[PDB]
Amino acid sequence: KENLTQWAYLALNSELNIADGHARQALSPGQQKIVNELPVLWAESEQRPVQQIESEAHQAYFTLLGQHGYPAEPGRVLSCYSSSVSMEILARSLSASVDRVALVHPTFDNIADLLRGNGLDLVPVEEDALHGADLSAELLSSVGCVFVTTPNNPTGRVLAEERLRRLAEQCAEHGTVLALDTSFRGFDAAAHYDHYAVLQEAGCRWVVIEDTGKLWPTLDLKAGLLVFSEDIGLPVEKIYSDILLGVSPLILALIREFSRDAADGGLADLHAFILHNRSVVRRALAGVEGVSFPDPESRSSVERVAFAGRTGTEVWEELQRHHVFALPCRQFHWAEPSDGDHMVRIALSRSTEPLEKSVQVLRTVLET
Template structure:
């Protein structure tokens, strides 16, 4: 569905993927203007020094001061999806993995493709701190969660880490949306290390800045892990681009110099526009407190479901995502939700939200 939206020859409104598809701010445009300089630096400066500086700038910008920068245990990938696939290949064949439910569907897809056995960990169980035991070998938590925006509180992560130590499990955190949410920016690495956990953390820059896929997925892992992560990494790529790493370093500097607030204001303005448009037809946001750049619309059980609404919106030139795939262990439970990306220009989001409201009104009247 996301590919269809990107390749729509008629230029439909694309509110599918969570990547930042925004206009550059003046500050970001000034960074982009320095790309020729970054190419020149990449030819005369060592890759390790460029990579370390980018890791330090980005991770400090999102509160991760205890991340193992400079230790060799943070690998730079060209996407967080590749990072996830590397982790899936590094885990033992046939391992049983508990994965948050619902969550971004490609996590489950990649793990299943690599021959892992999945069991769901519900958000409710996470909030109750009910962690799975044997035969689970690893526990995967998306923090903040996509698509719900749920943030795993620091105390809950500590509880999970301590549980995993007692049961010989690996904790895997997908923190791709962390940069958007201050509440999720407590020092995860400090919590995990203090518990003595075996951990893997995936970070992502692609959700923050409109750099047209010039992004980095960071794959960090604990000193305790015995998984062949470096081997799996080297099977997939040699290195990320030193130019993109410099770009990330510069954009991280802007993020702490007002960039975060500017992006947050736009996302909130877009969320408000969606709330207002859908409210006119009696719909509501499923996750009103979410702070990430996607929003789920809850659909009543007595009205059209998200698969039907999705098809109607396609006819009207609007691409959104029905949520059944996010409910990877129980797709039926996702039929009452549809997701819109908020990381778009305000006019795009407002127009798509009005179209969604109109389509829902007409489908409901025809039922």
């Protein structure tokens, strides 16, 4: 298994999948009511111009999460099948004019595998240095792009506004591209200050990749949103049009409707449900010997756990035998895999029952 997706494949057909980060819990009542009008949404998607549906979907999802200054003129937000598709467009776009990319480490490994597969070299930036300290002028001058995941995956760490401001400002000095993956944006209110405000204010060249997938159990019906400053001067628009005409108006209508249910109280319900499920795993494992939780303040839908006397791979292997699937964290540490030798990632975007089943099996594996 050469990336976390190949580990996650093994989980997809198991009742005890706690590996991939997609939302697989039950629909709420308000979400089921949306599913129930799909034949009506379908007809609306046949009948209306996609540009109207698309605008309403973007307006609903950005405002929902505080990004009021998002560029709303047609063309500026590029709807992609997935955040990974948005990522490939950007990585291939960079490769034309950039050699090296400074990337937060750790982070989800397909970000690095895509950047490398498109010919970019990476220089890692540990999280401490990223947040708690400016970045070295020797660094910025040697890279064409800076790339942050916030909320990060697997750590949940949020880039504070103050530091986002400084970072965009540093990038403006060097004419460097500043890129953000905000897939997890909706789980943590610390991420809902208007990033398009600080970004457009610094006036650097910037790219943001939003994602609607993680948040709601939509059966992987979703969009990645690629937003770029007017001065990006990367060929993201042409490469986008090489790949797709657009996304399905029905998926867009569904984003709109799920965004509106989130704004009528569904997002608070979701933050609570994720908190409950985080409590449930911590309740069952903090008292075990060796077990610590390194992201004590994470609000993300995935949770890391650390053990002191065995390797995260070995926990994975022992877990498999009882039909439970999580992720070994080595590969999140894409620049030094050993950094994640003693950790596994657990998915919380699951209904509480099979989650509890899984951690109790995790308990027993650890008490061996």
